[PDB]
């Protein structure tokens, strides 16, 4: 279709790293781009169908807080091409650097993430893997939600109880996206990952599933707004249908951002 | 279609100003947006067809240096919705402020503009009205090429001789876009508009048409690269088909930017 980029047009550059189901490279195509070369070689009919479905979903996204899809390749192999983002992931800023954001900045990041998610859900798109390592801070300022996944057990902390239980075939929903966002809020407000005092991964899975273990909200920073702590608890509610939806989440965080400037 | 935004979803805010064929407003729709309400009321079949054509062209643009189309409205009236840009136009920075960009910055702006235009031309899209007032410096850093046109005779300085002559019905081409870009380069390197020492608009039109008047390239700044001055003269060549195309223009400006960092 019209988003297919013919072979030879993109000059592939530096190998950035192993992403989600592919290898990401910086590239040149009318400026800078990112190019994820999918791991699949000799794809089955169902792998080609799944690729076309995902391109179809990405084609429906036009929002500043969603990583900008730019095109795809078929030959010599499957690939997704997007805008190049400058900087690092939110995971890197929060958990792999000595940079400490001020509360105004943290709330701005929460607001922009909420803008992107509110947008996705309005178009009936479920992310399914929202987490800080899938949020990029383009130019250290603009949230870009995507599927970066750079260096699974590395999504366990963001999984809602119904997802982690896996008691049904498709537990992913708007509501489980909201829970994952609640964990992102926990990361922003505490600067930390949840359950850091438990060293057994299998026991985190079991306890989050049965509702005996939840994020310790007493660890939020002293200047985290009371309303943000309340909103976070709502997003993290163990019962799927007691969680808020994104229009309200966005509206409240937008007001928190407005008060800070 | 799937880019139509139902009425009631967008909260229309501040009136920004009269744009090209419409009135621009800041709005709220999953975050910030811009909304141009077209002037046309009770559109004819051909005005509705022209609107659908333009949305069709905007749908083909996914590039960081092209203003991000987000959707459109039909009722109660025709409207184009895009991302909201922070800051002001390149025209404002160069000709309506005492801010003076350094040469590194000027060349960065030229590079990003070239990225956007190279992209458009690769998809066979002719802008037809490239000028500094149609280039926005989003967050004072990122070029966004669009159709802003905020407060015609206000495109005369960017018109190639064949356009200004109007000796045929459709003188707009990739090549006339390149000429307009050459005038944008003149704006960046001199900080000025061409022909400022002539106070008669009708005489500018006649002389640019017959090739007796061209931009005074001796006014470029002392630290404007010799290669940029040469490239600019090539873009401004009076004969349509002696001008370069954007792949080469982009490559050369990219190298100028690379040397400066
Ligand atoms: O890792 C990626 C990447 C990529 F190369 C291709 C595709 C994606 N994600 S994506 O498949 O297009 C995507 C998936 C889901 C969504 C959403 F948000 F659900 F809509 C948006 C985008 C990436 F995150 C990067 C894209 N731009 C970058 N800039 C810098 C770096 Cl270090 C990585 C990247
Ligand atoms: O003036 C506009 C505007 C708008 F409201 C609607 C549409 C457009 N342009 S556009 O029709 O979508 C458009 C037209 C042509 C192109 C291109 F580049 F040819 F592809 C891209 C975009 C605007 F420039 C602004 C868009 N975002 C803004 N942010 C701030 C301000 Cl002050 C104005 C605006």
B76 and B46 housed in the same domain = yes
Phi, psi at residue A38, to the nearest 5°?
A: -65, 145
Q: Is there a single domain that holds both residue A218 and residue A207?
A: yes
Same domain, A42 and A152: no
- State whether residue B119 sits within 8 Å of chain A by CB: yes
DSSP per residue, B18-43: EETTEEEEEEESSSEEEEEEES-SS-
- Contact assessment for residue A84 and residue A36, using Cβ atoms and an 8 Å cutoff: no
Task: Take residue A147 and report the two structure tokens written for it.
Answer: 């599927």
Q: What is the rounded distance in angstroms from the CA atom of residue B190 to the CA atom of residue B95? A: 11
DSSP A86: P
**What's the rounded Cα separation, in Å, for the pair B69 and B54?**
11
Judge whether B45 is closer than 8 Å to chain A, CB to CB. Answer: no
Point out the residue among A30, A139, A141 whose CB comes nearest to the CB of B63: A30
Pairing verdict, β B11-19 and B32-38 = unpaired
Q: Is B30 left (phi over 0), alpha (psi -120 to 50) or beta?
A: left
Residue B68: phi and psi, rounded to 5, are -80, 105
For chain A, the maximum distance between any two Cα atoms, rounded to a whole number of angstroms, is 55
Residue A129 annotated to the active site: yes
Q: What backbone phi and psi angles, to 5 degrees, belong to B62?
A: -140, 85
Q: How many residues in chain B?
A: 261
Cβ atoms B61, B125 nearer than 8 A: yes
Q: What CATH code is carried by the domain that includes residue A154?
A: 1.10.510.10
Q: Residue A159 is encoded by which pair of tokens?
A: 């999984």
Kindly state the tokens that stand for A214: 């939840």
Q: Do B107 and B209 belong to one domain? A: yes
SS3 A30: coil
* Distance (Å, whole) CA A139 – CA A210: 41
Q: Please classify residue B186 by burial: count the beta carbons closer than 10 Å to its beta carbon, then call 0-12 exposed, 13-18 middle and 19+ buried.
A: buried
If one counts every other C-beta atom within 10 angstroms of the C-beta of residue A136, the result is 25
A253: nearest CA in chain B? Answer: B31
The first and second tokens of residue B36, run together, are 């141009």
Q: Is the peptide bond before A76 cis (omega within 30 degrees of 0)?
A: yes
| Active-site residue, from A1, A32, A108, A129 | A129
For residue A32, what are the CA distances in angstroms to A62, A86, B116, B192?
19, 10, 11, 30
- B1 shares its domain with B111: no
Bond prior to A94 in cis (omega within 30° of 0): no
- Let me know whether B151 and B166 are in one domain: yes
A249: left (phi over 0), alpha (psi -120 to 50) or beta: alpha
Q: Say if CB A150 and CB A19 are below 8 A apart.
A: yes
Boundary (domain end) residue, out of B50, B70, B86: B86
Of the candidates A174, A67, A188, the one whose C-alpha atom is nearest the C-alpha of residue A131 is: A188
Q: How many CA atoms lie within 13 A of A141 on its CB side?
A: 8
What gap in Å lies between CA A225 and CA A256, rounded to an integer? 8
For A252, the 3-state DSSP assignment is: helix
Structure method: X-ray
* Cross-chain residue pair A115–B30, CB shorter than 8 Å: yes
Known binding residues of B for ATP = 16-24, 36
Question: In which order are the strands placed within the sheet that holds B22-28?
Answer: B11-19, B22-28, B32-38, B79-83, B69-73
- Mention every residue, 6+ apart, whose C-beta is less than 8 A from residue B180: B127, B129, B130, B131, B158, B159, B160
Look at residues A86, A111, A128 and tell me which one is the last residue of a structural domain. A86
Resolution value in angstroms? 2.0
Residue numbers followed by a gap, chain A, C–N over 2.5 Å: 151
Residues 6 or more apart from B231 whose CB is under 8 A from it? B185, B244, B249, B252, B253
**Helix B246-260 and helix B226-235, axial crossing angle in degrees, nearest 10:** 160
Q: Assess whether A101 and A147 both reside in one domain.
A: yes
Which residues does a 6 A CB cutoff place in the pocket of ligand 2?
B 16, 19, 24, 34-36, 58, 61, 66-67, 69, 80, 82, 84-85, 120, 125, 127, 145-148
Q: A83 in contact with B at a CB cutoff of 8 Å?
A: yes
Q: Are residues B37 and B146 in the same domain?
A: no
Tally of structural domains, chain A? 2
How far is Cα B114 from Cα B143, in angstroms, rounded to an integer? 10
Of A63, A86, A109, the residue at which a domain comes to its end is A86
> Would you state the torsion angle of the CA atoms of residues B186, B192, B198, B204, taken in this order, to the nearest 10 degrees?
40
A144 & A216 share domain: yes
Phi, psi of B109, rounded to the nearest 5 degrees: -65, -40
Contact between A24 and A41 (Cβ < 8 Å): no
- Based on the domain organization, do B127 and B33 belong to the same domain? no
Q: Answer yes or no: are the C-beta atoms of A111 and A64 closer than 8 Å.
A: no
Please check whether residue A150 is in contact with residue A198, taking contact to mean a CB–CB distance below 8 angstroms: no
Residue B175 CA to residue B228 CA, distance in Å, equals 18
CATH number for the domain including A77? Answer: 3.30.200.20
Q: Which H or E element spans position A95? A: helix A90-95
Say if residues A137 and A93 touch (Cβ distance below 8 Å). yes
On whether both A96 and A50 belong to a single domain, the answer is no
Instruction: Enumerate the β-bridge partners of residue B18.
Output: B23
Q: Is A9 exposed, middle or buried (0-12, 13-18, 19+ CB in 10 A)?
A: middle
Of the candidates B191, B253, B182, B250, the one whose C-alpha atom is nearest the C-alpha of residue B222 is B191
Q: Which residues form the domain of B57?
A: 1-86
Q: Are residues A5 and A119 located together in one domain of the fold?
A: no
Which DSSP string do the residues of chain B spell out, in sequence order? Answer: -TTB--TTSSEEEEEEEEETTEEEEEEESSSEEEEEEES-SS--HHHHHHHHHHHHHHTT---TTB--EEEEE-SSS-EEEEEPPPS-BHHHHHHS-S----HHHHHHHHHHHHHHHHHHHHTT---S--SGGGEEEETTTEEEES------GGGGGG--HHHHHT-SS----HHHHHHHHHHHHHHHHHSS-TTTT---HHHHHHHHHHTS----GGGS-TTS-HHHHHHHHHHT-SSGGGSPPHHHHHHHHHHHHHHH-
Q: Is A190 helix (H, G, I), strand (E, B) or coil?
A: helix
């Amino acid at each position: 279709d019209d988003w297919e980029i013919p072979d030879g047009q993109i000059t592939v550059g530096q190998r950035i790293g192993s992403g989600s189901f592919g290898t990401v490279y910086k590239g040149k195509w009318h400026g800078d781009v990112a190019v994820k070369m999918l791991n699949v070689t000799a794809p089955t009919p169902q792998q080609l169908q799944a690729f076309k479905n995902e391109v179809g979903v990405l084609r429906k996204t036009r929002h500043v807080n969603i990583l900008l899809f730019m095109g795809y390749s078929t030959k010599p192999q499957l690939a997704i091409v997007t805008q190049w983002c400058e900087g690092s992931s939110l995971y890197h800023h929060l958990h792999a650097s000595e940079t400490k954001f001020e509360m105004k900045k943290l709330i701005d990041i929460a607001r922009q993430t909420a803008r992107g998610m509110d947008y996705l859900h309005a178009k009936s798109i479920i992310h399914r893997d929202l987490k800080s390592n899938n949020i990029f801070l383009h130019e250290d300022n603009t949230v870009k939600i995507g599927d970066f996944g750079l260096a699974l057990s590395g999504s366990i902390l963001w999984m809602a109880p119904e997802v982690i239980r896996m008691q049904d075939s498709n537990p992913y929903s708007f509501q489980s996206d909201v829970y994952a966002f609640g964990i992102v809020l926990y990361e922003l407000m505490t600067g930390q990952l949840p359950y850091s005092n438990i060293n057994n991964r299998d026991q985190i899975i079991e306890m989050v599933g049965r509702g005996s273990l939840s994020p310790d909200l007493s660890k939020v920073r002293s200047n985290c707004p009371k309303r943000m702590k309340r909103l976070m608890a709502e997003c993290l509610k163990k019962k799927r249908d007691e969680r808020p939806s994104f229009p309200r989440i966005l509206a409240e965080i937008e007001e928190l951002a407005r008060e800070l400037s």
